[PDB]
Design a binder for this molecule. Structure first.
Ligand SMILES: CCCCCCCCCCCCC/C=C/[C@H](O)[C@H](N)CO
Ligand SMILES: CCCCCCCCCCCCC/C=C/[C@H](O)[C@H](N)CO
Lengths: 297, 245, 242, 58, 49, 242, 49, 99, 58, 48
């Protein structure tokens, strides 16, 4: 057993996370209390030290003479679900008749929300995000016309066989979930759970997925997180012959039940690649606009 | 009562007479993994004092034209002492950290350092300048080791993120006029209870001079920046033969 | 055969509509959530964190983009000259775009609450001086001199052991909220101007640098709120992200 | 109302109000979050907290 | 198939049918067809006053 | 005339959606269920049954497909040589595809839990010997020798009246679940390697066979779970089933 | 799969019909109402002036 | 040799820690595994052809015609269940027609 | 809720939660099964059960 | 880098002119005989 003092009194095993702060309810903005002129020495709220790394806690009352204002402005709309639960474009699938991209009437879209800056800048604000997903698929011809075409959307989890043709055996969907809708119908809409092996999706993974030498050929593996590879999206025109109409499919994603961790600085450079923080080295532009002189507006 | 401080852990002690308080990363002290959060079934090893000690890894010289430097964790200690030996012999890893940056000058020197801890600090390439080239940073840049790495474009932190918003992360300022040391205590920041200490870098420490160093000619021109750090509540699991990288 | 009558609004796809959707994976239980530090619960938590304010946002070249973060002070003639000016609008194009508060307020049409700006002095320990930082409420033009500038809300900053001072920009508006101000008719929602004047001088002894830099950090007070979530003003994308 | 407890925010100290028609809780609506904030946990994460009106460095 | 976008004051105004503003990642948008019943949404009191 | 508004997602056919359908035969009562033994209630019951592990999956010809089930041991030079290696991934292509556990895990993207592998010695009663079976956690390469292999989780197997020994592969992972690992970037979810080394030797007296075979049986422990049901990796069909 | 039967009057747009519409801005709280004098509550108040 | 799976546990072989396993076993149940619609039969109704040129076709009900479904159902010798059949009809080009 | 007791799993010791709109119980949803398992009935179906820690053959 | 691995203290010059380095009692034996060159270096205390 334990007989030595350094073991008996040891703090090893204390798994409680000492948290210096606790969350307090704040339905509305903080009220402003009455303040008066204050002329005293020794005590000084105005002078602070950003040196410490803590935001200055000086209030309005401690700097200027303020009145009593009952602030009833709600803080509900700035919450995570209010900010993120708005559907936005995350992927686009093109199904041309004659083309070089997908002339076979099917297309496999690797699920990733980094393909569009509007969504990417929002999601990339936090390092770790845990949420559900709601995907809506708006399909139409390039002219915006709706045509009587029947489509199949298949969810292909990682490891499942990827279809290789419009008549492939993988389309039997005996286990994979599939959605059969027509373009005349309203856009198909399904709810997707949190399927990551990790406890939260991580948009930035500062590491490598496998051991060994990372040479030039094995260099694209940096920044790729297998815990975010949620699978492939397979879409095809349901038929044996080629479809009569060209189709373009836009996939809109809307997060819900969102939880976020570890805020990081928001991107300020043009995006260049999916799952890659690369930026134009010679075209580094300032975050904000510039002015001719500092002493003038 | 707030300017003098002494940090002792393991068999090492670090003192300071011009401190500027201590920042606890995200208001959370390092702690051992709870049994409701652990996923590995093997009993982890907790070497305690043999690894939870202050390591002085390298010294960088601050110059009037310096751009800044960054280090990756626990890469800096993957090859240092009993901690590095345990990280090599064990697959899993979990620890906090206590980073103490030393940068001392005289009352006639001026300059400001921004010392921040950015979790999952993924380094990007310049993409060939124009952005049409899909490059990736080399191994020596993504995992610089104990020497750190000098930033090429500190404004975007070589990752397309402005440094003006870097203060949202746990950070301290080394302004030579008042303080000569920055202390940041960082708990384990990951989406997993354990992770590989070699492949994955939990966070990166950035030391970027925002206000350039200056002094009249005649004063001491060598102003070194020394990084001292100590893992806290370190755990290891999944023992096998040692792996060097 | 329950009689229902479809009302207008059917068959539409509203991106902000909160509805129920068919679950693709029945009986699927997500991975249990371990404790991760630094969880955010409201964007107001991020809006209250100080971030570097690009007051000196004159440069544009890459080799000197770093000097936009701080602006210099130096020994002067002691006539209360002007050091720097900047508008107090957080979501307006200008210095406030470098702040996390400004970046987030770019996502919200209306904001309400007092802002706070802290200036960190990075000069030598032997260098002293006093500076006057004045906030001019809306309606008044750019002050021509320190005597005019003092008439508004202002603070007297004394250099010392406490390197930084905090200037609180009080919430002074006719309306409960401010829409995003810009050139034209929408300048009606201007917040005002913040000007920094030399109170006495920048005094430095022999053997210490003659020019010192000031770092400005901007944040929002605890009464700051935002409303009417909107699209981002900047799209960080030129072509297709390949 | 016996459904699966498989929402992304299960096992939390906060209560949501959601509408659901399926046995899987992750299909429910976004609902309303609790208006709890911890501004200090980023803004003032210091070990020894210092009084507002006093001197930060003593 | 049409798209109705609500663009609050300050949001980027689309300048072309293929503009990047149509990604509607934050703005509320309605996608309906002419064959469908007319789109109908409820708008709150959004004035600062 | 109850006012309803159709929301997006109508008219679709979701294969995994659990809904109500019109019964074709009203008032039809199915045949009563008599008691039948061996009812399954959860696939975890099948995942905990030992099945032969094709460790020696080198042969391909039909006349010798049967020798894939077992691998041989024989008298050696006593230098701790290597006998057999195989990966511990159940749903990965390789030896584990011969097991019912592996076949079922092929239907599920994510698995979590410790696996168990039992080796049955089929040698003569007079033949003795000791073998070392070592499991190398992820990250370490294939051990070059027994001295390197012993450093991981291992068991010492002594031949005797108890023919078989059980090697437990503990659940050692950074993540709560493992996605299906394969060549490329998805090798991040590797489970490790299991290697069998001669501890001392295979000692046999005069008059007994010099070569003996070992049969490996693989199964999952009681903490084994599976998640994210997916499509099968193999489709046992070439054309149309006539 | 609740059986419903559409009755005549569907798909129409009645301008005076009082119905529910999808809110474009979830969790949006309008600006609080200060007291303004001279509030009308019924047009009969104006008809008596 | 006995024919029973070895009952050795993790604790009885190596030094283990205390882990509270909260991983649900709901998705591996019979209904979770099987209650996913999959193709079981296909009926062709050509205009000119030799298979069904008469505009009708009789499909003998059997789920063994497609390996995806057959491999799943054939895992057990005896199965007792209800069925839910969905009929997706379209022209060979994937077009919907007023028929 | 008086419907026909003609589901495929009627007369069982386990309780399901289903949604149904017709008088025939086999038209209901799949619902949720009970998470009962009998691993031993395949894994260790021996007549004389033997202790884990002891010797299987004595 | 090699020296930091043992017991050490970081000394910061300031108002407190002096710092105290404690040499802990680390020995295999309860006592140390007087060490010197030769076989009696077995009782060495170490280096500072
Ligand atoms: C109809 C089936 C649709 C299935 C939808 C699954 C979506 C799952 C949500 C998260 C998807 C991952 C988003 C991207 C993550 C990371 O940023 C990238 N993988 C970077 O490597
Ligand atoms: C619209 C009416 C559809 C009627 C659907 C009846 C389906 C009944 C379900 C079971 C059908 C038998 C499946 C095949 C069984 C055996 O494998 C084969 N008969 C082998 O001989």
């Amino acid at each position: 057993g334990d007989r030595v003092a350094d073991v008996i009194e040891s703090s090893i095993g204390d798994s409680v996370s000492r948290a210096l702060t606790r969350a307090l309810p704040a339905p509305t903005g903080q009220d402003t209390q009455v303040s008066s002129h204050r002329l005293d020495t020794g005590k000084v709220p105005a002078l602070q030290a950003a040196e410490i790394g803590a935001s200055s806690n000086a209030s309005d009352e401690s700097m200027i003479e303020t009145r009593c204002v009952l602030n009833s402005h709600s803080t509900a709309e700035t919450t995570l679900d209010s900010f993120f639960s708005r559907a936005g474009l995350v992927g686009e699938i093109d199904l041309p008749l004659e083309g070089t991209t997908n002339p076979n009437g099917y297309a496999n879209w690797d699920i990733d929300i980094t393909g569009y800056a509007q969504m990417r800048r929002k999601v990339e604000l936090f390092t770790y995000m845990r949420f559900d997903a709601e995907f809506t698929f708006v399909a139409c011809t390039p002219t915006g016309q709706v045509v009587p075409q029947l489509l199949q959307y298949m969810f292909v989890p990682p490891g499942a066989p990827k279809p290789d043709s419009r008549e492939s055996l993988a389309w039997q969907t005996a286990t994979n979930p599939s959605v059969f809708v027509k373009l005349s119908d309203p856009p198909a809409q399904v709810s997707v759970p949190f399927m990551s092996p990790a406890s939260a999706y991580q948009w930035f993974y500062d590491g490598y997925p496998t051991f060994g030498e990372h040479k030039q050929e094995k260099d694209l593996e940096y920044g790729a997180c297998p815990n975010n590879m949620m699978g492939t999206f397979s879409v095809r025109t349901v038929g044996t012959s080629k479809s009569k109409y060209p189709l373009v499919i836009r996939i809109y994603m809307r997060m819900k039940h969102v939880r976020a961790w570890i805020p990081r600085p928001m991107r300020n450079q043009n995006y260049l690649f999916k799952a890659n923080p690369n930026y134009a080295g010679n075209f580094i532009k300032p975050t904000g606009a510039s002015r001719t002189a500092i002493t003038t507006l | 009562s707030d300017r003098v401080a002494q940090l002792t852990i393991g068999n090492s002690t670090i003192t300071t007479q011009e401190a500027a308080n201590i920042i606890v990363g995200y208001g959370e002290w390092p702690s051992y993994c709870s049994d409701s959060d652990a996923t590995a079934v093997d009993k982890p090893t907790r070497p305690d004092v043999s690894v939870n000690r202050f390591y002085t890894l390298d010294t960088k010289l601050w110059e009037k034209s310096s751009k800044g430097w960054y280090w990756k964790f626990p890469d800096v200690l993957t090859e240092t002492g009993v901690f590095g030996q345990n990280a090599q012999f064990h697959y899993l890893y979990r620890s906090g950290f206590c980073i103490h940056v030393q940068c001392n000058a005289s009352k006639f020197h001026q300059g400001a350092l921004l010392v921040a801890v950015l979790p999952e600090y993924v380094i990007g390439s310049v993409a060939g300048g124009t952005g049409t080239e899909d490059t990736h940073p080399p191994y020596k840049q993504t995992q610089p080791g104990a020497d750190g790495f000098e930033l090429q474009h500190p404004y975007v932190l070589d990752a397309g993120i402005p440094i003006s918003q870097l203060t949202v992360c746990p950070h301290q300022w080394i302004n030579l006029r008042t303080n000569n040391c920055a202390t940041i205590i960082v708990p384990y920041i990951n989406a997993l209870p354990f992770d590989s200490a070699l492949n994955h870098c939990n966070f990166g420490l950035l030391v970027v001079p925002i206000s350039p160093l200056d002094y009249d000619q005649g004063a001491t021109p060598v102003i070194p920046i020394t990084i001292t750090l100590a893992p806290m509540c370190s755990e290891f699991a999944g023992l096998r033969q040692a792996v060097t990288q | 055969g329950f009689p229902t009558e479809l009302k207008p609004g059917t068959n539409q796809f509203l991106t902000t509509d909160d509805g129920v959707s068919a679950p693709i994976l029945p009986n699927f239980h997500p991975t249990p959530c371990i404790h991760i530090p630094g969880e955010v619960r409201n964007l107001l938590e991020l809006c209250q964190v100080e971030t570097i304010l690009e007051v000196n946002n004159v440069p544009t070249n890459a080799t000197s983009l770093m000097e936009r973060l701080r602006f210099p002070v130096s020994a002067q003639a002691g006539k209360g000259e002007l050091c720097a000016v900047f508008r107090a609008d957080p979501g307006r194009s200008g210095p406030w775009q470098s702040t996390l508060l400004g970046q987030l307020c770019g996502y919200y049409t209306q904001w309400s609450g007092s802002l706070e700006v802290t200036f960190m002095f990075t000069g030598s320990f032997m260098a002293t001086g006093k500076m006057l930082i004045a906030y001019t409420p809306p309606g008044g033009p750019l002050p021509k001199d320190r005597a005019t500038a003092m008439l508004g809300t202002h603070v007297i900053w004394d250099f010392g052991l406490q390197s930084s001072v905090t200037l609180v920009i009080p919430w002074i508006s006719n309306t409960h909220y401010r829409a995003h101000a810009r050139d034209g008719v929408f300048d009606y929602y201007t917040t005002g101007l913040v000007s920094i004047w030399y109170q006495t001088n920048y005094v430095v002894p022999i053997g210490a640098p003659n020019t010192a830099y000031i770092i400005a950090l901007a944040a929002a007070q605890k009464n700051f709120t935002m409303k009417l979530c909107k699209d981002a003003s900047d799209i960080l994308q030129t072509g297709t992200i390949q | 109302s016996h459904e699966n407890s498989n929402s992304a925010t299960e096992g939390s100290t906060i209560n949501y109000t959601t509408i659901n028609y399926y046995k899987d809780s992750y299909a429910a609506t976004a609902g309303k979050q609790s208006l709890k904030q911890d501004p200090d946990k980023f803004a003032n994460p210091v070990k020894d907290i210092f009084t507002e009106m006093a001197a930060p460095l003593k």
